[PDB]
């Protein structure tokens, strides 16, 4: 019992054991299951495995073998589930995963109970603006922002004038595969996006970005699910990994003169919200008339 307890606290030819963290976590899971011991530790390893498999580019034969053997018995159980919640007077039931949107009144008093004869699996994702601006932080993912002029030089963020076109350059890195990274770049109120989807009514990225052709070529190589040119933000859904950093470039215009706070660039995984990065805090943005 001393060795087992010590094992679940010990982190991970070279070693010669053909191993990895992913493989070893799945083998440890099967060992605990097989010997019907520490069921709470089994659930912890199962969640850890789900994130590691998700973030792994390719699996070795021994990794997929171990992962298959650790998870072959979970889908053999029915999808039926029952719960009594704080936000419902009536009991919640289903045969598959059913999502339920919640507001702040519901979330602060959120309580869920298992009213079934089998275990239920819950996932709770809450989001909103903090009371104050947090400091730049990063876990798995990395993000950096830089603003260039259409001349390919770094733009002096003070000498910005109403009407100027700027190229906003984002670079996203990751220590493992993030197949579902969401890049949210909230704009300073003085910058407006040149909507590329409405080509007739805006300045062209292709035409105004000739001096950053390397960045456009890097961006063309990225696996991009979609790009959104919204009122207050630039959004990109992308896949990223350690051997392939992602370059994104968008065209913006300095519009309303004023002094603007600059939100930090953000990137996070939809499936693993703990894979998150906030870029360096920038100086105030001044748009001159």
């Amino acid at each position: 019992e001393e060795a087992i307890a010590l094992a679940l606290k010990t982190p991970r030819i070279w070693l010669g054991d053909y191993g990895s963290s992913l493989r070893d976590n799945a083998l440890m899971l099967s060992l605990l299951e097989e010997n019907k011991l520490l069921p709470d530790e089994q659930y912890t390893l199962l969640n850890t495995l789900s994130q590691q498999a998700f973030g792994e580019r390719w699996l070795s034969t021994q990794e997929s073998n171990a992962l298959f053997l650790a998870a072959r018995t979970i889908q053999d159980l029915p999808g039926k589930w029952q719960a009594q919640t704080s936000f419902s007077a009536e009991q919640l039931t289903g045969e598959k995963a059913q999502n339920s949107n919640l507001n702040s009144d519901q979330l602060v008093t959120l309580q869920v109970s298992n009213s079934g004869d089998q275990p239920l699996w819950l996932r709770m994702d809450a989001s909103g603006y903090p009371q104050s601006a947090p400091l730049p932080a990063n876990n798995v993912l990395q993000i950096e922002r830089h603003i260039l002029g259409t001349d390919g030089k770094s733009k002096s963020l003070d000498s910005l004038r109403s009407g100027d076109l700027v190229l906003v350059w984002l670079q996203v890195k990751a220590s493992n595969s993030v197949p579902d990274a969401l890049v949210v770049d909230l704009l300073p109120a003085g910058l407006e996006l040149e909507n590329q989807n409405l080509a007739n009514g805006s300045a062209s990225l292709e035409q105004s970005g000739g001096e950053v052709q390397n960045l456009l070529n890097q961006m063309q190589q990225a696996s991009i699910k979609h790009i959104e040119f919204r009122d207050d933000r630039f959004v990109a859904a992308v896949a990223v990994d350690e051997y392939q950093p992602v370059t994104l470039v968008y065209l913006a215009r300095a519009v309303t003169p004023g002094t603007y706070q600059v939100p930090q660039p953000m990137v996070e995984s939809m499936y693993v919200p703990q894979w998150r990065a906030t870029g360096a805090a920038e100086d105030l943005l001044i748009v001159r008339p």
Binding site: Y129, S204, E228, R230, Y260
Partner: protein, 776 residues
């Protein structure tokens, strides 16, 4: 003298030097035959036309072996005058072969059909019952209600029984959002649904299913747009400039509420770019030196102020006076509001080094080949190493007509692999007017460039690689392009009671066929002769032809190899009496918060019987419609306008041997609300009385700008459409310019434009106060 080769079947010749042993030996696939087939593919059937090479058109055709993907024959028979054949077409059909013992001709459906890019064979694919999908706009903001209307008619715009149409709302990701069963109300389909505020941005669409399981699409943008408050016109010169000429753009700006952009700033960019696709009439033909340097540049940054009339001029002196290649100057102009928000437009000015230029089109495919010098995969025209490279060369003006020239320096250049560009081969070409020059050069390996120089010093060149192809081919990039037969018609439009007189002006003499086609097959199956320089022939337009996908086609061949030429032309059957003369009477100018009255008057000459005319009136802000240069939906052009050519032509004359939802927005943070006003109105469909008169009253709110009045009219076969512009403006306009949003702790200089649109001087006091999360 080879007796086994005189037998039927496809052969392969593998040659080698007597006692030589190499990795690869020259090999070719061939068939010995003087038979020349020319098939026509349709949605259900396939009509093949057997012929013969040299002097003779031996049309008899029983010998048609149509093989599938497995390699088994499906059908074989004979028909028509001198010979022809009609067969059942398959979706996964692969081959076509000719004769049992009297030689063999190979034609495969796997190869791309003849490229008719030089012919006007474009239009709607709705050959079946027509469903016209229309609305007041094609641009919506998330959280808006999408308005869509519909009218169902047959192939000839005639009414049919009340049937349900199933409509699906498709997201940019391709997933369906909602599915409905639309039922008509007084012959009109009307679909309305609200976009969520968390809706994805991009190209959404509504797909309709009439029952044919062939979806009809209605595209609409869902974007965070701002309606334009200004109109910007940037005009160059229609005719290209010479390399010595100064480039000039005339600028016109005005507020849509009816006032010039007096003193407004215009910021912009001037760019120099090559004009390789210099002739739109010749798609695929490239013009200019690809080896020429400094053709892509940023000329200047434009900064000017419009005069009191809202006028300006943009100019730049020429810095390409010695160019031998066509160029273009692009002006990307941004007309700014007093707050800074622009209205951006682009204008292009063509520059031609001469009045007529040489153009090159490779006859070989363009495949995606990786280049490690640029570390990026780029699609470039490639040909097999040790094979000849074919090219189409033309000496054309801006309009597309080929001019006569003599002394073209056709040069095959071998580009340095790892000294200087090695000139491999040289030629001298003479061109006739309306003639397409065809040059073939023996190519070795590596990078190559084919350049043609005209006596006026104008140089045009195309780069091409010689090597291997690891699949990854562009969808029919190496399709055969036939020589053009300019077909002329006597009348602009025809009808069941008329008689067509077509003039077949082929480049030379040649036997073949002349016919009228549809997507279901031909209607004038045979006509065979062509003699001298032109042929005027009679075509009686039949009364049962109730469709607008009807086209005309000709084929001619002449031996020296028998050069083949094709002619294609749309047959117009859209009658003008089926169009409703819809008149709209609206005031030119009006005040905000007052109702707008639209006076409708439907009529037609000689008839003048507008029996139960239905009118759907709508009014949309011009600043919305100008973003996507929205065209007023026309029901006449929808149901009677030129439809696409329903046939595919295959021939072997090109191969003849010669010797959750909202989850992403939740992660980013609740977006701030945008309170912009989208002025859109759609009144219910009204009925016009005995005289063909009616009135619609649309309530207009607190709007200052221009409003486009749009109307759609219908009966059973009569369709009409009209538009009028209504300026909605107050005596004194007071408009506030603000950013799209503001963040906490930001400072913004808002701008309030107070404009006196009266003939009298005004004295006003402006009292300002701030509430909510704003302070002055």
């Amino acid at each position: 003298d080879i007796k086994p080769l005189q037998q039927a079947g496809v052969y392969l010749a593998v040659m080698n030097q007597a006692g030589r042993y190499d990795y690869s030996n020259p090999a070719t696939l061939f068939t010995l035959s003087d038979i020349g087939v020319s098939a026509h593919r349709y949605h259900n059937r396939l009509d093949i036309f057997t012929q013969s090479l040299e002097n003779g058109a031996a049309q008899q055709g029983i010998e048609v072996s149509l093989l599938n993907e497995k390699g088994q024959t499906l059908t074989q028979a004979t028909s028509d005058a001198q010979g022809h054949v009609q067969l059942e077409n398959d979706k996964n059909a692969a081959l076509l072969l000719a004769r049992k013992d009297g030689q063999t001709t190979l034609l495969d459906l796997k190869l791309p059909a003849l490229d008719l890019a030089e012919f006007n064979i474009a239009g709607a694919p709705g050959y079946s019952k027509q469903f016209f999908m229309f609305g007041p706009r094609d641009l919506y903001r998330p959280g808006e209600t999408v308005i869509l209307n519909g009218l169902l008619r047959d192939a000839d715009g005639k009414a049919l029984p009340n049937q349900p149409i199933k409509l699906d709302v498709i997201k940019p990701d391709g997933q369906v959002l909602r599915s409905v069963v639309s039922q008509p109300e007084n012959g009109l389909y009307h679909f309305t649904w609200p976009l969520d505020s968390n809706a994805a941005t991009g190209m959404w669409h509504i797909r309709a299913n009439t029952g044919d399981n062939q979806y009809r699409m209605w595209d609409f943008h869902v974007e965070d747009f701002m309606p334009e408050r200004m109109a910007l016109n940037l005009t160059g010169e229609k005719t290209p400039l010479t390399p010595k000429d100064e480039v000039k753009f005339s600028v016109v700006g005005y507020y849509l509420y009816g006032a010039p952009a007096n003193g407004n700033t215009l910021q912009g960019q001037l760019f120099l770019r090559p004009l390789r696709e210099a002739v739109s009439a010749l798609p695929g033909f490239e013009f200019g030196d690809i080896a020429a340097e400094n053709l892509s540049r940023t000329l200047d940054e434009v900064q000017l102020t419009l005069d009191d009339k809202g006028r300006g001029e943009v100019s730049t002196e020429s810095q390409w006076k010695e160019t031998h290649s066509p160029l273009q100057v692009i002006f990307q102009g941004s007309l700014l509001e007093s707050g800074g928000r622009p209205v951006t437009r682009r204008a292009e000015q063509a520059i031609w080094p001469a009045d007529a230029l040489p153009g090159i089109r490779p006859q070989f495919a363009s495949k995606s080949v990786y280049d490690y010098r640029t570390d990026s995969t780029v699609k470039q025209p490639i040909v097999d190493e040790g094979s000849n490279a074919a090219f189409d060369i033309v000496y054309s003006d801006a309009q597309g007509v080929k001019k006569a020239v003599s002394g073209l320096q056709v040069r095959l250049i071998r580009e340095r692999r790892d000294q200087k560009d090695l000139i491999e081969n040289e030629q001298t070409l003479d061109l006739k007017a309306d003639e397409t020059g065809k040059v073939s050069f023996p190519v070795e390996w590596g990078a190559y460039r084919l350049e043609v120089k005209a006596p006026n010093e104008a140089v045009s060149s195309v780069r091409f690689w010689a090597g291997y192809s690891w699949q990854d081919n562009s969808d029919g990039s190496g399709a055969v392009r036939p020589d053009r037969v300019t077909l002329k018609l006597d009348k602009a439009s025809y009808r069941p009671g008329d008689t067509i007189k077509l003039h077949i002006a082929a480049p030379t003499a040649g036997k073949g066929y002349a016919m009228v086609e549809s997507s279901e097959g031909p209607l004038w199956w045979q006509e065979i002769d062509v003699r001298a320089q032109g042929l005027d022939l009679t075509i009686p337009v039949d009364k049962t032809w109730n469709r607008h996908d009807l086209y005309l086609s000709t084929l001619v061949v002449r031996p020296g190899t028998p050069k083949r030429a094709v002619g294609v032309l749309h047959l117009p059957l859209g009658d003008e009496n089926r169009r409703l003369d819809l008149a709209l009477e609206t005031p030119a100018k009006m005040r905000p918060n007052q109702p707008l009255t639209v006076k409708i008057k439907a009529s037609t000459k000689n008839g003048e019987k507008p029996k139960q005319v239905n009118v759907l009136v709508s009014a949309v802000d011009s600043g919305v419609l100008n973003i996507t240069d929205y065209v007023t939906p026309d029901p006449w052009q929808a149901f009677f306008g030129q439809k696409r050519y329903g046939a595919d032509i295959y021939d072997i004359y090109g191969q003849v041997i010669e010797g959750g939802d909202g989850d992403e927005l939740k992660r980013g943070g609740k977006p701030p609300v945008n309170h912009v006003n989208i002025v859109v109105q759609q009144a219910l469909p009204v009925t016009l009385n005995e005289q063909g008169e009616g009135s619609v009253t649309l309530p207009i709110g607190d709007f200052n700008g221009e409003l486009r009045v749009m109307a759609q009219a219908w009966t059973a076969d009569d369709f009409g459409s009209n538009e009028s512009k209504v300026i909605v403006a107050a005596p004194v306009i007071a408009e506030l310019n603000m950013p799209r949003f503001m963040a906490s702790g930001d400072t913004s200089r808002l701008t309030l434009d107070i404009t006196n649109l009266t003939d009298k001087p005004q004295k006003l006091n402006v009292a300002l106060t701030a509430s909510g999360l704003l302070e002055l």
